[PDB]
Ligand binder design. Structure first.
Ligand SMILES: C[N+]1(C)CCO[C@@](O)(c2ccc(-c3ccc([C@@]4(O)C[N+](C)(C)CCO4)cc3)cc2)C1
Length: 516
C-alpha cells in the first residue's frame, strides 16, 4: 500500500542530510587563494575517524548490500560465492599496506596526477576515460537499485524518487565539495548501521523464518545458503575474487580519501579501519540474505512462487524488509539503503567530477585559467555528471551489465598502469599504450553475456548459455590483466633499449618519453 507517514519521514531525512551538508559547506568555507583544490582534496585536514567513517560509507552502497544478499540468497551461488565482503576488506588492507603510503607521502591531488606526469596529458585523458566510465556506470547502477527498492517498498513512481535522490545528492556535493560529502558520510554511515542492525532481530523473529543455523548445513526449502565451490569452478571463483581484490584499489573514490588524510600514517590506519568497517557493515547483509533464503514464502504475505522463481532474486533485501519486518522497521531499512546509495553515488559523482575539472580541463585544455573559472566549471561538471548519471539510470535498462563491464575494464586497464607508475621504475609511454591496447582488445574479444556480444576468441572450456551466446569459463579477466602488465613491462624495456642502443633514430619517436 501507499503509506504517506514514512514518505514524509524519508523526505525529512533527505532534508536533514541536505541541511547537514550545507552546514558543513558553510563552516569549512581550505586555502585562502587557491580554491581549485579546496574542493578536490579538501585542504588536507581530514582526521582519522572522520575519514575512516567517510570512506567506509563510500564503499558500502545499496548495490553492494543487494549483491551480497543476492549471492547469499540464490541456491547456486551461496555464501561461498558471496565474495564481496572479504574481497573489499582484502582490497582495502592491500591498498593501505602498499598503495596508500606513496600516494599520500608526496602531495598528489587526484588519482590521475601520477599518470599524467609520467605518460603525458594525452595518456592521462586516455586513462581518464575508463575511470569516468566506471564511476558514471557505478553511480547509475546504484541509483537504479535505489529506484527499484523505493518503488518496491513505498510504491512511489520509479521516475520521481531516483530523480529527487540524485538531485539532493548532486545539490549538496555541488554546494560543499569533499566537506559536504565527508561530514554527511559520518551521519549516513551511522544511519546505515542503525537501519540495517535493528531490522535483523525483527526479521529473525518472524514465524516464517525458522532455524537460520540449521539451513547453513542442511537443505529444507532450497540448497543451503552456505554454498560450496566445485572442483571445476575453482578458477572462475579465483578470477572473480581477484577482480574484487585488485579492481577495488584504483578507483578515484578511494584515492580521493587517502590523499585527504592529515598525515601519511593516518591514511594507512584509515584504510585498515575501513577494511574492518566493511566487514562490520556486511554482516547484516549476509544475515538478511540468509533469512531470505530460509524463509518459507508461502507463510508470508508475498506468497508463492518465491522471488527466485519470478526472476526477482537480484533484490532480496527490500522484500525481506517490506514483508518480514513491520512497517516502521521497513522504513528504517529503506532509510539505511537510501543512505548507502546516496553515500556511494555521491562519492562517485564527486570523484568523477574531480578528474574532469582538475587535469583534463585545467591541466590539458585551458592550461592558463583563473581559479574562479575552474571552481565554476567544477560546479557545472558536478551538476552535469549528476544529471547524466540519473538519466542513464532511469532511461536505460542495461545499466547493470554495463556497470560490470566497466568495472572489469577498469580492473584490466587502470590497475596495471597504477602498479607500473609507482612500483616499477623506467616505465615509458609506449609500454603504457601497448598495455592499454592489449587489455582493451582482450576484454572486448572476451565478450559479455549481458551485452549479448559474441566473443571473437574462444577460450578453452567455453559453454553456451540459455540465451544462445557463448560464455567463457576460463579466467580471461586476470589473464588479460597479467598479459597487459607483462606486455607493458616488455614494450617499455624494449623501447628503452632500442632508443638507448641507437637502432631507431632519436628523432623518430613521437611521445618523446624516453629521450626526455
Ligand atoms: C552473479 N552476478 C550477478 C553475475 C556474475 O558476476 C557477479 O558475481 C558479479 C558481482 C559483482 C561484481 C562487481 C565488480 C566490481 C565491483 C566494483 O567495481 C564496485 N566498487 C567500485 C564499489 C568497488 C570495486 O568493485 C563490484 C561488483 C562483478 C560480478 C554478479
Amino acid at each position: 500500500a501507499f503509506h504517506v507517514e514514512g514518505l514524509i519521514a524519508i523526505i525529512v531525512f533527505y532534508l536533514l542530510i541536505l541541511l547537514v551538508g550545507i552546514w558543513a559547506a558553510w563552516r569549512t568555507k581550505g586555502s585562502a587563494e587557491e580554491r581549485s583544490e579546496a574542493i578536490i582534496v579538501g585542504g588536507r585536514d581530514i582526521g582519522l575517524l572522520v575519514g575512516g567513517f567517510t570512506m567506509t560509507a563510500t564503499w558500502v552502497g545499496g548495490g553492494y548490500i543487494n549483491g551480497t544478499a543476492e549471492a547469499v540468497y540464490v541456491p547456486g551461488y551461496g555464501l561461498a560465492w558471496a565474495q564481496a565482503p572479504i574481497g573489499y576488506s582484502l582490497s582495502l588492507i592491500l591498498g593501505g599496506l602498499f598503495f596508500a603510503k606513496p600516494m599520500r607521502s608526496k602531495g598528489y591531488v587526484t588519482m590521475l596526477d601520477p599518470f599524467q606526469q609520467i605518460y603525458g596529458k594525452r595518456m592521462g585523458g586516455l586513462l581518464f576515460i575508463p575511470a569516468l566510465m566506471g564511476e558514471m556506470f557505478w553511480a547509475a547502477a546504484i541509483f537504479s537499485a535505489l529506484g527499484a527498492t523505493i518503488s518496491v517498498i513505498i510504491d512511489v513512481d520509479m521516475h520521481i524518487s531516483v530523480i529527487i535522490s540524485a538531485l539532493i545528492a548532486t545539490l549538496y556535493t555541488l554546494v560543499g565539495g569533499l566537506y559536504s560529502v565527508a561530514y554527511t558520510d559520518v551521519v549516513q554511515l551511522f544511519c546505515i548501521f542503525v537501519g540495517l542492525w535493528i531490522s535483523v532481530p525483527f526479521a529473525l523473529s518472524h514465524p516464517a523464518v525458522a532455524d537460520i543455523g540449521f539451513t547453513a548445513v542442511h537443505a529444507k526449502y532450497q540448497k543451503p545458503w552456505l554454498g560450496t565451490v566445485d572442483s571445476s569452478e575453482v578458477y572462475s571463483w579465483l578470477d572473480s575474487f581477484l577482480l574484487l581484490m585488485l579492481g577495488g584499489i584504483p578507483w578515484q573514490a578511494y584515492f580521493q580519501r587517502v590523499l585527504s588524510s592529515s598525515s601519511a600514517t593516518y591514511a594507512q590506519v584509515l584504510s585498515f579501519l575501513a577494511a574492518f568497517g566493511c566487514l562490520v557493515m556486511a554482516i547484516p547483509a549476509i544475515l538478511i540474505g540468509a533469512i531470505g533464503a530460509s524463509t518459507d514464502w508461502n507463510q508470508t504475505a508475498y506468497g508463492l512462487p518465491d522471488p527466485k522463481t519470478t526472476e526477482e532474486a537480484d533484490m532480496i533485501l527490500p522484500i525481506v524488509l517490506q514483508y518480514l519486518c513491520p512497517v516502521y522497521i521497513s522504513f528504517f531499512g529503506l532509510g539505511a539503503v537510501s543512505a548507502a546509495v546516496m553515500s556511494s553515488a555521491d562519492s562517485s559523482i564527486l570523484s568523477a567530477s574531480s578528474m574532469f575539472a582538475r587535469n583534463i580541463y585545467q591541466l590539458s585544455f585551458r592550461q592558463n585559467a583563473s581559479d574562479k573559472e575552474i571552481v565554476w566549471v567544477m560546479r557545472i561538471t558536478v551538476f552535469v555528471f549528476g544529471a547524466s548519471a540519473t538519466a542513464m539510470a532511469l532511461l536505460t535498462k542495461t545499466v547493470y551489465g554495463l556497470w560490470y563491464l566497466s568495472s572489469d575494464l577498469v580492473y584490466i586497464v587502470i590497475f596495471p598502469q597504477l602498479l607500473c607508475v609507482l612500483f616499477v621504475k623506467g616505465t615509458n609511454t609506449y609500454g603504457a599504450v601497448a598495455g592499454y591496447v592489449s587489455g582493451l582488445f582482450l576484454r572486448i574479444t572476451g565478450g559479455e553475456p549481458y551485452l549479448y556480444l559474441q566473443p571473437l576468441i574462444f577460450y578453452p572450456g567455453y559453454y553456451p548459455d540459455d540465451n544462445g551466446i557463448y560464455n567463457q569459463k576460463f579466467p580471461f579477466k586476470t589473464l588479460a590483466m597479467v598479459t597487459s602488465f607483462l606486455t607493458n613491462i616488455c614494450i617499455s624495456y624494449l623501447a628503452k633499449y632500442l632508443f638507448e642502443s641507437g637502432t631507431l633514430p632519436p628523432k623518430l619517436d613521437v611521445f618523446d618519453a624516453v629521450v626526455a
